[PDB]
Structure to design on (1520 residues):
C-alpha cells in the first residue's frame, strides 16, 4: 500500500468540518477558561502586584501567581528552568506573570488586563551587539568547531570573499493556536492538547502537580499545524491548565488568542552570519570560515540543539577541506526562540549559500557551475567527509541538479532573461538554482526511538496506534499504509487512533523529520510480530511452513487453500492466539560528540534542488515569484502525493521566510508585529505561477522503512533559491554587490538595488 | 507483594465518595437521556403503535422503534438473536418496545409511559410444566449425560431416596444499576458502561451501528457490583445508547431505574430438580439419577453454558459410580435468565446435596458421615473421575472438613442442640455441614484467554492494564500486586487503568471466577518481558549475566553494585530500550465435549466447607442464622484479606438465595417482586452472629499464578449449609420428611414444619 498516492487520513473530515481540533471538543458545562496576564517590561524586578481588580472582574474564579504553584514552576524543554509564572522579575515583554481562570475565554482575557503592577526596570538586552557587548549568552561561551586550518587555507587563496549579513526570524503562524485542556480524573489528570510532544507534556504536568508520571495521561489526536512551534511551547498551556484544575476542582481549558500567541511563544532563531570563503583557481573551495550570532531569547528552550544543527549545516551542499564555525548563542530579552521546520539547518545552509554566491560573483563565475563543481562526490578508496567527519556516501546532487537544469530549461531561460533585462529599465527578472543536503535524525541521539501498539479485532479490522503526532503532514496515512502493507490487507481495515502516552510510552517529540522514518519501523515491527503469529498458526494448522503462508490483498494463502484474512483471525482467536502487539525502533549507526564536533550524528542525508525565477520593481522593490521548478529526493517515497505536498508547502514556507515574513521589535522590546495584519505569510497569490515539483525516485542506501526518506524539513530549504534569485535580479541592476539582506522585503530589495546601482 | 493482605485499590476513593461510577462521570450539557417503553403483555403480536403522545411529551428529542434501528437489532450473547427493540411481537412483560431520548432522565421515563399500544394477545407459557407440556424449549430437546448404568445400580440398592424439589431464581441486586453512555467520536463511537464484558459491548455496538470493530472503543473503569448480571445484559443499554447517539448527533446516556432494571434484566435460573439416589449397606453411593428442569425465559441468553455447568456439578462433592442427568432448558415468557455467581453450579450442587441428605435421613444415618464417606479420595493406580470423566486429583475435602468440624466444635455442638431442642416446644435449632467442589474455567473453552499491556515511564512509575473488569472483587489489587512482585518494586509505583478495549483486545467477559487466574498470568507475562529487557541492559552494561541481575524491593543489584529501579529505568530509556510490553495467557490442559459429556472442561477444583447453625420458630416460620464457620481453599491466596472478603460476602449471598430472596410472578406473567421493598436481600442484621471464616493454605497443584486459586464463585456454594441447616431444624420437629423447598422463606419453613409434624 506503501507507495500509492492515497489521501490524508482525515481528508473528508477536514473538508466537511467534522475533524475536531482541541477547542472543538465537547466539555462539561463547568469547564473554566484561562488567560495569562503579561509583563509589560523587557527587563525588570516586579515590585508590586495588586490583583484585586482581577479577582473582582466578572466571571472570574481563581487567579494564580508563582506562589500559588503547588510544585515545580518550569516549562523549559531543557535542564535550565523557565518559569511558567514569573518569579519576582520578568525578562521580556510577554512573559506571563499570573494566571486567570474565569467562566469564559473573554472573561478571562478581559481580567487579564486589569492588574496593577509596579516594576523596577533594568537595562535590557535587545540586540545581538548588546548581547555580545554584555556577554549575555548561553552555554558559558561560544561553541567552536574546526576541521583543517582555515586561516592558512584562506591566506593563500586565489579567490576570496568576505561578507556579513542578517537573517531574520519567522513566526510559525500555525492556523490552530496553542491550546490545551485538563480534566481532573480521580487522583490524576488527563490532558488533551495541541502539541507535538505529549510525552513531555506529561512530564511537565506531572512535575507541576507533584504526581508520578503514571497519574497523567496526554491524548492528542491532531494539531492544526505545528512546524516546530509546538515542540515545546505546548508546556505552559498544559501546566496552567493542570494547575488551575487541581485547585478549582474543575476541568480547565486554555487557548491563546492570536495576539497573545505571537507575543508569548517563540520564533525561529534570527541569525547574523559573518563569513570568509575561499577557493582555488579552478574553483574548488579551499576553506570557509563562519561566525554565527544567534538570537535566542530570554531562556534556553531548544537553542542548544538548534544552533548545533546550523553549525552542522554550515557546509551547505559542498565538500570543504577546511571549515570553521564559531557559534554564539546570545541571550536577550525577547521571546525565547525555539524550533521551526529546519531547526537551525536553513540558517546554517543559507550561510554557506550566500557565501558561495558572493564568491562566485567575485570571480565573475556562474554560480551554478561553481556549486556544481563543489558538490560532494557521488557514491561508489576514501570517501569525503563533512567537517564533522561523517562520510557522505549518498550524495546524488550532481546527477539531480543536472536533471533539474535540463527539465527546467535552465540555460536557455537564463539567456532569455539577460536579453529581457537589457531591454527594461524599471523591472528586472532574476533566476537562481539552489541545492539542499539535510541530515536525518535528532542530534540529541537518544531521542531517535519510537513505539507503536497494534490490535487486531475478531472481525478482522485493525486499530493502529503509534508515538507520532499528526500535524497535517500525512504521518498517520503513511503509518496506516505501512501497516496495511505489512499485514497484507487493504488499508480500509486499518483505523488510526489518537496519540496517547498511555498507549505508547516515552516518546520523542514528533520532529526532526523523524516522524515517519521511525514510527514506520515501529509499526512495521508490530505488524511483523502479529503476522508472525498468524503464519505460525496457519502453518501448524495446515501442516507446513510459516514462511509459505501468504498474506496479500486481504487474503491468506497456504497449501493451495485460501481464506479471507478475517477468517484467519477469527480462527486464531478461537485458537487463543494473542492478537495484540507492541513494536519499537531505534535508529542504528549513530554516535557523535557535540563538544568535539565529530561523529555520525545522522543516518543519511536528504537532497533536492530548486530553480526559482522572480522579478523585481526597480523603483519600489515590489516583487514576486513567477516560476519555480523542484526536483527533490524522498527516497522510495511512502506516498508520492503526500510527499509532493510537503515539498510544495515547505517551499512556499521557505520562501515566505526570506521575503515578506518580518519580525520587528520596538526600542523597548515590544513585539510590534504580533498579528496577521502586520506579520505577512505567503498569501494565495504569492504562489509561484508555474510550480513544477517532481521527485527523484531512488531507494535510500540505508535501511529505512521501505527505503523511503524523511521529507518534512529538507524541502523547506529549497526556499533559498528564491532569495538567491531575488538577489540575481538586484545584481542585474548595477555592477556592485547588492548585499541583499534577509528577509528580502521590498524595502530590503529596493535597498539592494540601490547598492548595486551604486546610488548609495 | 503477592500474599500480603492489602486493601482494595480504590478503598480511599470508595470511602470519601470520590470514586466515580458511570452516572457520576461529567458529560456535555447536551447529553441526552434514555428509557425504553415496555410491553405489558407476556406474549402477543403488536398490532398498533401510536407514539405520537410520546414525541409530544416534554423534553423529548427522538423516539425509536425497531424500524428505526439502522442495522442489527440483536443483543444476545448467543448465536440466536434477541432483539433490542421488539419486532412485531413481545414475549415477556418488560420487553422493550421502543426507545425515548429526552433532555433528562425523568423526562424520558415519563414519556416512556405515554404510548398507545394495541396487542393481539396469545396464550403465554409461564411455568415449567406449561413449557414442559408445550414442548417449549431451547436446544431442540433435553441434554442427557450418563456414566455407568444407573437403573441397574438403583434397582439393586440397599438404600434409596426419591425426591423432587424446587429451587428459586435470584435477582442480582447490584447496588449500581445497568448503565451506559456513548459519545460519537468522529466516525465512530466511544462507549463508557457498567459491564463485565466490554469486548462484547464492542461487538454488539459495532454491529448495531454498522461499523467495523475498530471504530468502537469501550472503556470501563469499575462497576458497582455485577455478580453475573453484567455478563451480558449490558448489551441493550449500550446498543440503545449508541444508536440514539448516531441519530441525534449527541452523547446519549442510559441508566435503568431500579424498578425497570428488575423487570427487564434476567435473574438466576430457577430450577426444579427430581432425583433418585441409592447406596450400599455401608453407605457408599451406588448411583444417582437426576432431572433438571430449568426456566430460562424467552430467549437463549447464557442458558446453554449455565445449564451445562449445573450438569457439570451434579455430583456435588461425591464420587458416584453411576450417575445420569437429563437437563431440560425450558423457554417461558419471562425475563431471560442469565449468569449469576455460580453460573448453574449451585443449582447443580444443591441438587446432589438435597438428595444425599434425603438419603441420609432415610437410613437413619448422620448426613455428615454419609458425606464424609463419599467424598472423592485424596490425592497420591487409577484416580477417580467425575461423571464427565475428569480425574479429580486434588480433592482435600476429607482433611479439610475434619479440620473444620473440630475447630467448630461440631459434635459437642450437635449434642448441645439436641438437648436444647428437647426442652423447647416453640423454637428449634438446627445445624448442618456442607461441602463444596467447584471447577474453574469457562466451559466454553476458547474463552479462557486474557491479555495485559504494561508501561514503565522514565521516572520509574508504572501503568498497568489488563482485560479484567473490577466489580468489587479486588481484581485490580491482585493485579497490581502480581505486577509489583514480578517487577521487584513496591506496589505504590504501579497504577491501574480503566479496562479499555483499545488497549487489550478480544477479551472474555470477566467471569467464571477466572479474572485473576488468567489476567494475573498475562500480567506476569508482560512484566517478565519488561524485567527481561531491563536485566539484559544492566547485564551488558556491567558485563555479566542477566540471570544475576536482581530486582527486589525497589532496588536493582548486579556485580556488587546497586541502584534504584528508577535509575535503572532512566538509563535504559537513554540506551533506547523499549519500556512497553503486552502479555497474554491461555489456560492449558482443557478439552471436553458438551454433547457427549466427556472431557477435561476444568483446570482444577476449588474446595471448602461450611457449618451453619440456625433457629426457627415453630409457630410462624421466622428464623435466622446464629452462627457459621467456614474453611475455604483459596490455594496460595494472592491476598487473604481480599479472599476472606469474597468468602464472607459470598456466603451471605448464597444463604440470601436460599432464605429470603424470592421471585414472584402473577397470573399475567407480571413480575410482582420488582424492587427492594418487595425482593429482600440479606440486611445487616441477617449476618451470622458468629461468623468465623478461615482459609486452607495450600498451593495449587496446577500452575496458576502464584499457585493461588479462584475464589469468586466457589464460596457462594457454601450457602447451602444454611438451607441444609434450616432443614435440620424442621426435621427436629417430627419424624416426617419435611420436604423443605427453596427458598426457605418463613412461610416455606413453616410449611416444612408441619409436614414434619404430620399436621398435613
Ligand atoms: N502540514 C504540516 N507539515 C509539516 C508540519 C506541520 O506543522 N504541518 N511540521 C514540520 C516539522 S517541524 C517536522 S520536524 C515534520 C515532521 O514530519 P514527520 O513526522 O514525518 O517527521 O513536519 C513538517 N511538516
Ligand atoms: N464484590 C463483588 N464480588 C464478586 C462479583 C461482584 O460483582 N462484586 N461478581 C461474582 C462473579 S459472577 C464472578 S464470575 C467473580 C469474578 O472473579 P474474578 O473476576 O476474579 O474471576 O466475581 C464474583 N465476586
Ligand atoms: O535535530 C532536531 N531537528 C528538529 N526538527 N524539528 C524539531 C527538531 C529537534 O528537536 N531536533
Ligand atoms: O462457565 C462459566 N462460568 C461463569 N461464571 N460467571 C460467568 C461465567 C461464564 O461465562 N461461564
Ligand atoms: Mo521540526 O522543526 S518539529
Ligand atoms: Mo460469574 O457468574 S459472571
Ligand atoms: Ca510561535
Ligand atoms: Ca439482574
Amino acid at each position: 500500500s506503501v507507495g500509492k498516492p492515497l489521501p490524508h487520513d482525515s481528508a473528508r473530515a477536514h473538508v466537511t468540518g467534522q475533524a475536531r481540533y482541541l477547542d472543538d471538543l465537547p466539555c462539561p458545562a463547568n469547564t473554566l477558561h484561562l488567560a495569562f496576564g503579561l509583563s509589560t517590561e523587557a527587563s525588570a524586578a516586579i515590585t508590586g502586584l495588586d490583583l484585586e481588580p482581577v479577582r473582582e472582574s466578572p466571571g472570574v474564579i481563581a487567579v494564580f501567581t508563582a506562589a500559588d504553584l503547588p510544585h515545580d514552576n518550569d516549562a523549559s524543554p531543557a535542564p535550565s528552568p523557565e518559569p511558567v509564572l514569573a518569579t519576582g522579575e520578568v525578562h521580556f515583554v510577554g512573559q506571563p506573570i499570573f494566571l486567570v481562570a474565569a467562566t469564559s475565554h473573554r472573561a478571562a482575557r478581559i481580567a487579564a488586563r486589569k492588574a496593577r503592577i509596579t516594576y523596577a526596570p533594568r537595562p535590557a538586552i535587545l540586540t545581538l551587539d548588546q548581547a555580545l557587548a554584555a556577554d549575555s549568552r548561553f552555554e558559558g561561551g561560544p561553541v567552536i568547531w574546526a576541521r583543517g586550518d582555515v586561516e592558512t587555507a584562506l591566506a593563500g587563496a586565489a579567490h576570496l570573499a568576505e561578507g556579513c549579513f542578517e537573517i531574520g526570524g519567522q513566526e510559525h503562524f500555525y492556523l490552530e493556536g496553542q491550546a490545551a485542556l485538563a480534566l481532573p480524573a480521580e487522583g490524576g489528570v488527563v490532558i488533551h492538547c495541541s502539541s507535538q510532544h505529549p510525552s513531555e507534556i506529561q512530564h511537565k504536568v506531572a512535575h507541576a502537580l507533584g504526581l508520578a508520571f503514571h497519574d497523567v495521561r496526554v491524548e492528542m489526536r491532531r494539531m492544526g499545524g505545528g512546524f516546530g512551534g509546538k515542540e515545546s511551547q505546548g508546556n505552559h498551556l498544559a501546566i496552567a491548565c493542570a494547575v488551575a484544575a487541581r485547585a478549582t476542582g474543575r476541568p480547565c481549558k486554555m487557548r491563546y488568542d492570536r495576539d497573545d500567541d505571537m507575543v508569548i511563544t517563540g520564533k525561529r532563531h534570527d541569525f547574523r552570519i559573518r563569513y570568509r570563503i575561499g577557493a582555488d583557481a579552478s574553483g574548488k573551495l579551499l576553506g570557509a570560515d563562519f561566525v554565527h550570532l544567534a538570537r535566542c531569547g530570554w531562556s534556553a528552550d531548544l537553542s542548544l540543539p538548534v544552533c548545533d544543527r546550523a553549525m552542522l549545516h554550515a557546509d551547505g551542499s559542498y565538500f570543504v577541506p577546511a571549515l570553521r564555525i564559531e557559534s554564539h548563542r546570545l541571550r536577550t530579552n525577547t521571546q525565547s526562540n525555539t524550533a521551526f521546520r529546519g531547526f537551525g539547518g536553513p540558517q546554517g545552509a543559507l550561510g554557506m549559500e550566500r557565501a558561495i554566491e558572493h564568491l562566485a560573483r567575485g570571480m565573475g563565475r556562474d554560480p551554478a557551475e561553481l556549486r556544481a563543481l563543489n558538490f560532494y562526490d557521488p557514491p561508489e578508496k576514501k570517501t569525503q567527509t563533512t567537517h564533522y567527519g561523517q562520510e557522505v556516501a549518498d550524495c546524488v546532487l550532481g546527477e539531480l541538479v543536472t536533471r533539474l537544469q535540463k527539465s527546467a530549461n535552465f540555460t536557455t531561460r537564463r539567456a532569455e532573461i539577460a536579453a529581457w533585462n537589457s531591454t527594461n529599465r524599471t523591472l528586472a527578472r532574476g533566476i537562481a538554482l539552489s541545492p539542499v543536503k539535510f541530515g536525518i535524525s535528532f542530534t540529541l541521539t537518544h531521542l531517535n526511538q519510537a513505539g507503536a501498539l497494534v490490535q487486531i479485532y475478531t472481525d478482522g479490522s485493525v486499530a493502529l496506534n503509534h508515538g507520532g503526532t499528526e500535524m497535517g503532514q500525512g504521518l498517520h496515512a503513511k503509518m496506516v499504509q505501512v501497516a496495511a502493507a505489512v499485514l497484507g490487507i487493504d488499508p480500509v481495515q486499518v483505523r488510526i487512533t489518537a496519540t496517547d502516552t498511555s498507549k505508547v510510552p516515552n516518546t520523542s517529540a514528533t520532529a526532526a523529520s523523524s516522524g515517519a522514518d521511525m514510527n514506520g519501523m515501529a509499526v512495521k515491527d508490530a505488524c511483523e510480530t502479529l503476522r508472525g503469529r498468524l503464519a505460525g498458526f496457519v502453518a501448524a494448522r495446515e501442516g507446513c511452513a510459516a514462511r509459505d503462508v501468504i498474506f496479500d490483498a486481504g487474503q491468506v494463502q497456504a497449501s493451495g487453500k485460501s481464506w479471507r484474512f478475517a477468517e484467519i483471525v477469527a480462527a486464531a482467536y478461537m485458537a487463543r492466539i494473542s492478537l495484540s502487539a507492541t513494536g519499537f525502533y531505534a535508529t542504528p549507526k549513530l554516535s557523535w560528540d557535540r563538544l568535539r564536533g565529530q561523529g555520525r550524528p545522522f543516518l543519511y542525508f536528504a537532497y533536492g534542488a530548486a530553480i526559482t525565477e522572480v522579478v523585481i520593481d526597480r523603483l519600489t522593490g515590489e516583487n514576486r515569484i513567477l516560476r519555480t521548478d523542484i526536483l527533490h529526493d524522498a527516497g522510495a517515497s511512502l506516498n508520492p502525493a503526500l510527499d509532493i505536498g510537503q515539498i510544495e508547502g515547505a517551499y512556499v514556507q521557505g520562501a515566505g521566510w526570506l521575503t515578506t515574513e518580518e519580525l520587528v521589535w520596538d526600542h523597548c522590546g515590544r513585539l510590534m508585529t504580533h498579528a496577521p495584519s502586520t506579520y505577512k505569510i505567503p498569501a494565495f497569490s504569492d504562489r509561484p505561477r508555474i510550480f513544477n515539483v517532481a521527485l527523484w525516485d531512488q531507494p535510500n542506501r540505508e535501511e529505512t522503512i521501505f527505503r523511503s526518506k524523511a521529507v518534512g524539513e529538507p524541502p523547506f530549504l529549497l526556499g533559498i533559491s528564491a532569495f538567491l534569485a531575488l538577489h540575481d535580479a538586484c545584481a542585474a541592476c548595477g555592477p556592485h554587490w547588492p548585499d541583499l539582506q534577509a528577509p528580502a522585503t521590498p524595502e530590503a530589495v529596493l535597498a539592494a538595488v540601490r547598492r548595486a546601482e551604486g546610488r548609495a
Notes: The pocket of Oxypurinol (ligand 3) is lined by residues A 228, 231, 302, 305, 309, 339, 343, 442-443, 511-512, 713 (CB under 6 Å). Residues 444-602 of chain B form a domain with the Aldehyde Oxidoreductase; domain 4 fold (CATH 3.30.365.10). The first helix of chain B runs from residue 11 to 15. The radius of gyration of chain B is 27 Å.
